[PDB]
Design a protein around this ligand. Structure first.
Ligand SMILES: CC(=O)N[C@@H]1[C@@H](O)[C@H](O[C@@H]2O[C@H](CO[C@]3(C(=O)O)C[C@H](O)[C@@H](NC(C)=O)[C@H]([C@H](O)[C@H](O)CO)O3)[C@H](O)[C@H](O)[C@H]2O)[C@@H](CO)O[C@H]1O
Ligand SMILES: *[C@@H]1O[C@H](CO)[C@@H](O)[C@H](O)[C@H]1NC(C)=O
Ligand SMILES: *[C@@H]1O[C@H](CO)[C@@H](O)[C@H](O)[C@H]1NC(C)=O
Lengths: 172, 319
């Protein structure tokens, strides 16, 4: 992954996270929780089914072609027919191999990207109220109950509410 | 100040290996196979029209060999030719065999139009024990075997068919090859015989060959088959001093020829599929298949690889 999030500074994935591709895991005074992030999840999924659909159904509708199996050699004409078919098959096999390698390299970067976007979005909501711990986690320097946590998850967290408490904790 | 919030992603216990430009084995959460490697053990009779030749191959169908009567009027997207097709008539060859077979197959229909040939004093409808029909000596039902009169005449034959319809016509005609000059003489009197079939733009001439040939269906003699396409506005002239296996009419050609032929022993079933291989129909949405290079219809592309996995999910890093 180009972004270094998945299999990077996020050390591993969460098997317990079963209702989304990405999400939040918190610990505050009243306990711990894990919740999926819908928007990051959907963005990744949309970009992947997009590839799927461009792939599945294109147009190879072919009827009369050329003979492709022969009992006995005939020479020149048969040689050409076999050479044309063998040439055609190698080119398509090459196309299929390259296609899957490009798509997969792209898919992995996209999913690594969405992980990083989610992390960066939360970081921006938190302003000066929190610090990156380096493992995809933020230390929050004010009391943050379940309602608070949820406000960060749904994007209504108002950093001004907690800023004075947070600044004081970070710097004294 | 010490609550903590972590951002993360899902994982599963065991994911699927895929390739990238960089790595041949990368574990991702989900993947999808792009190569179809399973086929149906049968051919789907819908939505393409398949005609099963059964015992007759397409050439024998065209000539009207015995056993091929089920092919009269037949219309197909794909003619299904059987490997165990069996000769049932006079030993014959076709000099440009694969070319005739292609034309018949591509054309896509057996629509025969009887025509009246006023052959001179010669007698018509020669038959053989090599071509028994209902245990009675017979011949190709699209062909007319001409021989000398009882009063030993084979006058130079010369009649003409004019195309003023709105479709190209296909005439199939043959040339008989006796094993002896005695055989030749008792049949056509003249020696040597000869055929020339002409159009405005072509003329094709065949000199009969006489020789000892292997016994096929109890015969050392042979028939060689030829064809002539007559476009509208053109016409066909038949010329003989002996040895002509004459047409009884013409096959109709479509302006647009869109059909083909598939040689396979696979039985026709009751499934639905637009993709047919010589190993059976495919029922798939995958873009590729490794089942056979021989494929007709709306098919995945044939490739050499047995598997190609598309990642449909992120990297799998569990715990
Ligand atoms: C014609 C003649 O005067 N001679 C008679 C021979 O036909 C016959 O010779 C035997 O012929 C055997 C098979 O004969 C056929 C056949 O294919 O069924 C009989 C057909 O009626 C005849 N068709 C015609 C004349 O249009 C056909 C044809 O001549 C040849 O196929 C052309 O090559 O002959 C087979 O060859 C035997 O090996 C041979 O003994 C003899 C003996 O029965 O009788 C003669 O009167
Ligand atoms: C037959 O041949 C003659 C010359 O031999 C030619 O002039 C004539 O057009 C032909 N007629 C028919 C009925 O084939
Ligand atoms: C097609 O692929 C499968 C594995 O996916 C393999 O077992 C089979 O041999 C392949 N078919 C051919 C004709 O190579």
């Amino acid at each position: 992954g180009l972004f270094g999030a998945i299999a990077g500074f996020i050390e591993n994935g969460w098997q317990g996270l079963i209702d989304g591709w990405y999400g939040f895991r918190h610990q505050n005074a009243e306990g711990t929780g894990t919740a999926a992030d819908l928007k990051s999840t959907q963005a990744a999924i949309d970009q992947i089914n997009g590839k799927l659909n461009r792939l599945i159904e294109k147009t190879n509708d072919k009827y009369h072609q050329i003979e492709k199996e022969f009992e006995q050699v005939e020479g020149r004409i048969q040689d050409l027919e076999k050479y044309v078919e063998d040439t055609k098959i190698d080119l398509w096999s090459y196309n299929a191999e390259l296609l899957v390698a490009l798509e997969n390299q792209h898919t992995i970067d996209v999913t690594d990207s969405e992980m990083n976007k989610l992390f960066e979005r939360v970081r921006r909501q938190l302003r000066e109220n929190a610090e990156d711990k380096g493992n995809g986690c933020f230390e929050i320097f004010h009391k943050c109950d379940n309602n608070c946590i949820e406000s960060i998850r749904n994007g209504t967290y108002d950093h001004d509410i907690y800023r004075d408490e947070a600044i004081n904790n970070r710097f004294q | 100040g010490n609550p903590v919030i972590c951002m993360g992603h899902h994982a599963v216990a065991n994911g699927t290996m895929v390739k990238t430009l960089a790595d041949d084995q990368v574990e991702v959460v989900t993947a999808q196979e792009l190569v179809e490697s399973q086929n149906l053990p049968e051919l789907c009779p819908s939505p393409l029209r398949l005609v099963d030749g059964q015992t007759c191959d397409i050439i024998n169908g065209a000539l009207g060999s015995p056993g091929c009567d089920h092919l009269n009027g037949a219309e197909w997207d794909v003619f299904i030719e059987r490997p165990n097709a069996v000769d049932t008539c006079y030993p014959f060859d076709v000099p440009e065999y694969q070319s005739l077979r292609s034309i018949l197959a591509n054309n896509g229909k057996f629509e025969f139009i009887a025509e009246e040939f006023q052959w001179n004093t010669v007698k018509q409808n020669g038959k053989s024990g090599a071509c028994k029909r209902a245990n009675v000596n017979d011949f190709f039902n699209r062909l007319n075997w001409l021989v000398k009169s009882d009063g030993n005449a084979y006058p130079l034959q010369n009649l003409t068919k004019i195309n003023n319809g709105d479709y190209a016509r296909l005439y199939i005609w043959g040339v008989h090859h006796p094993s002896t000059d005695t055989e030749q003489t008792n049949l056509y009197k003249n020696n040597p015989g000869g055929v020339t079939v002409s159009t405005k733009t072509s003329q094709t001439s065949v000199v009969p060959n006489i020789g000892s040939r292997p016994l096929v269906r109890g015969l050392s003699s042979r028939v060689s088959f030829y064809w002539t396409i007559v476009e509208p506005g053109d016409l066909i002239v038949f010329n003989t001093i002996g040895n002509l296996i004459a047409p009884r009419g013409h096959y109709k050609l479509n302006n647009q020829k869109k059909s083909t032929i598939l040689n396979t022993a696979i039985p026709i079933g009751s499934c639905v599929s637009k993709c047919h291989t010589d190993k059976g129909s495919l029922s798939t949405t995958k873009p590729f298949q490794n089942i056979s290079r021989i494929a007709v219809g709306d098919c995945p592309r044939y490739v050499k690889q047995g598997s190609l996995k598309l990642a449909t999910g992120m990297r799998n890093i569990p715990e």
